[PDB]
Symmetry: D3
Subunit: 158 residues, 6 copies
Amino acid sequence: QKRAIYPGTFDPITNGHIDIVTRATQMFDHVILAIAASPSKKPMFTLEERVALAQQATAHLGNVEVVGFSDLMANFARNQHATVLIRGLRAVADFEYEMQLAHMNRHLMPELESVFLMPSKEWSFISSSLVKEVARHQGDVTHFLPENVHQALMAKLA
Amino acid sequence: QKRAIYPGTFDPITNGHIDIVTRATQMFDHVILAIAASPSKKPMFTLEERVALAQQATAHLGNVEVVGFSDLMANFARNQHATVLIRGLRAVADFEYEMQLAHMNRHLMPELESVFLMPSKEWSFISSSLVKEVARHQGDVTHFLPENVHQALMAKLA
Amino acid sequence: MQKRAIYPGTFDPITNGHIDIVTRATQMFDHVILAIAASPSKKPMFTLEERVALAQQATAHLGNVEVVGFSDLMANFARNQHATVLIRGLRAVADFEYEMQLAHMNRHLMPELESVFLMPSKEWSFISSSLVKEVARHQGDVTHFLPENVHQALMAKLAV
Amino acid sequence: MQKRAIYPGTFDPITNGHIDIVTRATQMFDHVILAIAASPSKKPMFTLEERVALAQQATAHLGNVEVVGFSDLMANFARNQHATVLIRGLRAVADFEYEMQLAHMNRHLMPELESVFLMPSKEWSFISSSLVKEVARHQGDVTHFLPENVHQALMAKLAV
Amino acid sequence: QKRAIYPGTFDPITNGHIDIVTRATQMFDHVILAIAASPSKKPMFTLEERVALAQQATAHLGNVEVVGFSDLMANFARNQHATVLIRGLRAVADFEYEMQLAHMNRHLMPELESVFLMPSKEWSFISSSLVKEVARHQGDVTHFLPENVHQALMAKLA
Amino acid sequence: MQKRAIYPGTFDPITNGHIDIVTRATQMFDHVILAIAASPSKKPMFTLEERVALAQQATAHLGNVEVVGFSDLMANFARNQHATVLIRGLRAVADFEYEMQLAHMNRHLMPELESVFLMPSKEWSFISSSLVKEVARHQGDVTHFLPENVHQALMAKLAV
Ligand SMILES: Cc1cc(Nc2ccc(C)c(Cl)c2)[n+]2nc(Cc3ccccc3)[nH]c2n1
Ligand SMILES: Cc1cc(Nc2ccc(C)c(Cl)c2)[n+]2nc(Cc3ccccc3)[nH]c2n1
Ligand SMILES: Cc1cc(Nc2ccc(C)c(Cl)c2)[n+]2nc(Cc3ccccc3)[nH]c2n1
């Protein structure tokens, strides 16, 4: 049984994240979508909210398990028995910072292999930050988010 | 009559911004220099100050209109009847984030065409952030700002 | 203002990404010259005559586009055409550094010509004529990336 | 899941960076095909027969690797091999834009094939087969970058 | 006597910084490791702490002098009689922002030549920010820091 | 310290950007060798003899520059010249990834040689010898980018 972890802040989870996790479930037996608490990022949604949103957004995928964590990423991957670490790559600016994290995760857990997947062209220019910025200005972001997430974001900003 | 919008935080407007807006006025009949309130960026100058500074800095250009806005960028462009959205491109790091905004603006207003212009080599390595950092340390930034802006920045920091 | 813009390239062959850019250009400028380089520098798959006819058929629906071959520097041609705008397509996969070099050099050669970067649809942001040709030459399906007339001419060229 | 992955390239010659990537791939997928392109497009230093034998000897210690030559598009070969994973090595010096083009094109040609980017050790993150060949051709020491069998074959090729 | 300045926030100084300063001492007669106060960055260590840490971390290098500063970087270089300004370059994302600072420093002090050095592959994927993030999550960062710095970081976070 | 630095390149032809870099290098090191690669690998516009004479005339005003041709790897030549500094120009349009590969490879070949990246004036940050040659070959004005002796020699070369 191959177990992969897809960690991130997911504040909130977008269609780009759904795309990545869906690709991951087609490749690995079990995928842990791991939501980092990330207090330094001052997230819009609490960890509990982010977990609830991602669980509903991924309920259609049978081999996904959504879990929150505040640990060091490498320790949490070891403790979940994961040997693959999934990250999405949309652009060059992502790639450079992604390399630092992957080399650090390799130093901390050499058997955890980092994998980068590329999202659909449809989601190649979006991010949670961008979607929140548009939504803060009352712009329509229904296209970019799961239904439950879009409702939660509208409600949070109301 | 072709109407172009050149939006930004302009905190404060620099010679690089003047270069871009001047190129835009040579290409389009009317240019709206649109200053975003941008409270999340915690700007050094108030929106009212930024508008006043840009109006004086662009007074020599007959077909420029300076306007502040707090709306979604795409809604403000529609409401100004603009069909061109101007942005400057100085480097690769700009380009990637510029692409996200342009694809988002296209989703929100498909008839608003994003245009990128390249500033003079003279202003290719400056930014409002960099000019403010130098000025906070009492470094001479007269070369990079319109006269009225340089006075305002010295006064603000005094 | 009655602006004349130039959209230069080798267009070997013209793709849906090029049609997207030129269409956007026609919505913002009064006259767009789709300027096809004679460029035997990197031996093109289609000859200049083929490239021009294909681009004319593929842009025939755009009333303010004129397709013209040129053999000089793109700035020398823009000057002779009285163009004041130079259209460059900026894909997510473009060599931005090259575009910077080109634009600063064009500005030195012809300061009255302004380089304007337009962005294609996300659909065409990850392709190039080079990639399309190599895929087609190596028996891959490129139908989606090309105008129908171009696809028919490309199949004919690869058959021989 | 019994995954079949493909790791394509020219492998002219196979380097320690390629061995690093294929080793990582064998730890995550059940079967990895190290797919060597016939590619006389940019006249390779080693012939296809040489490239295959070198890669077999250099990966002989990996039980789930199969070295196979191919002359078609990498997607046409992946399809015929029933591979659903395409391995790409991502060095700190890789052309990320090219990798994006390639992956989106491979996805168009074969949607059921997923591109997977793996990162080599920092030790091999700043090399390329091209750089290694040019250094070796110009009398520089490349012993550190190659498997011993490859280093012996490269010295033999440069001697003539 | 050629004098080079190697300025930075050094919050805290890492093995990557030690690598750069060591390369600089092999090339120039005297190297000033100059620690910027950087209050806008809200540093984890005080300037006094950062200076003490870097002095101990570089004590083995005879031609290094560690000095704190709050001045404009170019004025401090002039006042130290430096004619070379050293900066490390690990990646493309560094390079673009490094170019802006170097062109600004050249405008402010044309005789101060910026030099970029490349660290060892060993430290090409680390940064003070990354090391602090790992350490905040109790991850082992002994590999990336001088002994005295690692102790100070553990103590600061305890 | 009495440092010897090497500034290698093809210098085909030497431009104002190269003069800017070598001038900056002479202000920081005691002796700078402007090292001209014999490089017939990508058939140069000027021969090695032409490239050397042009670079000597163009740097004659710099007392601590020595112009020397070399045909070996840049590290093998730096070693034989007892250079401990390798100068690389970093333009805003440079291929940073290539510079990283090159520097890490030079460090492997000769650890005692330190790569030093210098930045040219903003005036020359968006040019390359390749761009200058292509513009000049295609009837564009490159006077601004070259030393006067180089401009005269380039016009003579293009006339034939
Ligand atoms: C200024 C300039 C440069 C140049 N080529 C070139 C060379 C080297 C570099 C490093 C760069 Cl950045 C560009 N061309 N090619 C042309 C003619 C042409 C037009 C359209 C497509 C193909 C050819 N016109 C022009 N004008
Ligand atoms: C989709 C595609 C493109 C392509 N070449 C290519 C062309 C142009 C661009 C601008 C890009 Cl991004 C790529 N090749 N080469 C192959 C065959 C092959 C496999 C492994 C190594 C060498 C050759 N297969 C394939 N498949
Ligand atoms: C280490 C090394 C590589 C190399 N060429 C090269 C090859 C491939 C890649 C991908 C890269 Cl990054 C570089 N050359 N060319 C030389 C000789 C020379 C000196 C100056 C200008 C031209 C030629 N010396 C050297 N040393």
